[PDB]
């Protein structure tokens, strides 16, 4: 459900960041732009900066600099059929979700009901209760987290 | 015989004109103006009381200019060009700058 | 550089704009998330990239899209390059 690779990550720096705090700025930018974001169906759960290989030249574009930082990336992903468990969350009568460490499960409307919040899919689940689900369909992630239409196991 | 022509062309690559030095100075000046760290020797609190163009010229002359230029499939620093041409163009540029009250 | 900056929009009018590499639409921002509506409707996950162009360019391309022409942009992903020391060259004559 995960793998590891060696690759370059592209990043952009401003001139005022080309000071003695260069490594700190590089690391902060890399984390900000790749830490927990889902891109092309995969997420980079852990990023290591080599610190032991030659840094390539930076490209000057308009008033900014572009750098290819070498790194070792630990990619993680999910597919259909995976069984996950997470805390239930209800914000309204139509939006019911399950929050995990790095995964969000969305429940279809024609699966249960919301009343008070509480969920009734054949059993009573309280707002914040922990429930098990199985991913069914994929979508685009939001706020650094996987999104999947899933049904309660 | 292709090797001979290749060597002649590689040597030809090292000549320097106004366009290239003007571009290098432009890049360095823009980056310095927008707030990068000067790379002169003996950097200290006194370095900030000079003229930025003096700083750029000093960096060029002492071989610490960070700009790298690509010309004919190669990558050259400002010190890989012929030295006499660099001096020639810099003399002209500094004269005209002095006329403008920049240097 | 002089003409490049003359023909450009004022640097004080900059803003972040994204484009979908698949169809060329200006990606919308819904609840703070960049999203291409057309490609999302088709169950696709294209790359959104930042561009810096003039407003009139966007107007012209949109109007061309109205007439039925699809305009797609690619971006350069050149591999990294490294500096190598170079031997000295004199170039003066033998006098």
């Amino acid at each position: 459900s995960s793998f590891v690779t060696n690759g370059y990550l592209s990043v952009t720096l401003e001139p005022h960041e080309l000071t003695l705090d260069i490594k700190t700025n590089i690391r902060n930018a890399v984390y900000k732009t790749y830490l927990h974001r889902e891109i092309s169906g995969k997420m980079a759960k852990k990023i290591e900066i080599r610190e032991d290989v030659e840094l390539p030249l930076g490209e000057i574009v308009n008033n900014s600099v572009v750098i290819n930082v070498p790194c070792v990336i630990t990619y993680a992903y999910y597919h259909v059929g995976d069984i996950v468990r997470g805390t239930l969350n209800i914000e309204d009568e139509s939006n019911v979700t399950i929050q995990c460490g790095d995964l969000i499960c969305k429940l279809s409307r024609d699966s249960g009901t919301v009343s008070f919040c509480f969920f009734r899919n054949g059993n009573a689940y309280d707002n914040g209760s922990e429930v098990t689900a199985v991913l069914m369909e994929a979508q685009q992630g939001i706020e650094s987290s996987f999104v999947f239409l899933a049904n309660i196991v | 015989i292709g090797n001979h022509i290749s060597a002649l062309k590689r040597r030809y690559t090292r000549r320097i004109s106004l366009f290239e030095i003007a571009g290098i100075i432009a890049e360095s000046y823009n980056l310095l103006q927008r707030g990068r760290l000067p790379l002169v020797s003996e950097f200290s609190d006194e370095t900030m009381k000079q003229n930025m163009l003096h700083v750029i010229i000093q960096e060029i002359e002492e071989g610490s200019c960070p700009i790298v230029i690509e010309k004919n499939g190669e990558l050259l620093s400002v010190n890989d060009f012929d030295k006499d041409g660099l001096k020639f163009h810099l003399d002209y540029i500094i004269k005209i700058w002095k006329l403008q009250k920049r240097y | 550089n002089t003409i490049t900056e003359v023909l450009k929009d004022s640097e004080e009018d900059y803003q972040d704009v994204y484009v979908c590499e698949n169809c060329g639409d200006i990606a919308a921002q819904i609840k703070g998330i960049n999203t291409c509506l057309r490609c999302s409707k088709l169950n696709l996950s294209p790359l959104l990239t930042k561009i810096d162009t003039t407003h009139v360019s966007k107007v012209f391309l949109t109007q061309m899209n109205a007439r039925g022409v699809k305009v797609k942009l690619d971006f350069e992903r050149r591999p990294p390059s490294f500096y190598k020391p170079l031997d000295k060259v004199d170039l003066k004559p033998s006098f």
């Binding site: 030249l57 600099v65 | 960070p66 790298v68 | 550089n1 003409i3 490049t4 390059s81």
Partner: peptide, 29 residues
């Protein structure tokens, strides 16, 4: 190039410029 707000391959723009960070990263506070 004018359409997309790029630098023409004329004069100073005939070349491509990089920045060498090697020396800067070899300095320590």
């Amino acid at each position: 190039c004018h359409f997309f707000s790029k630098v023409p391959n004329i004069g100073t723009g005939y070349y491509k410029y990089f920045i060498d960070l090697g020396l800067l990263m070899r300095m320590e506070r």
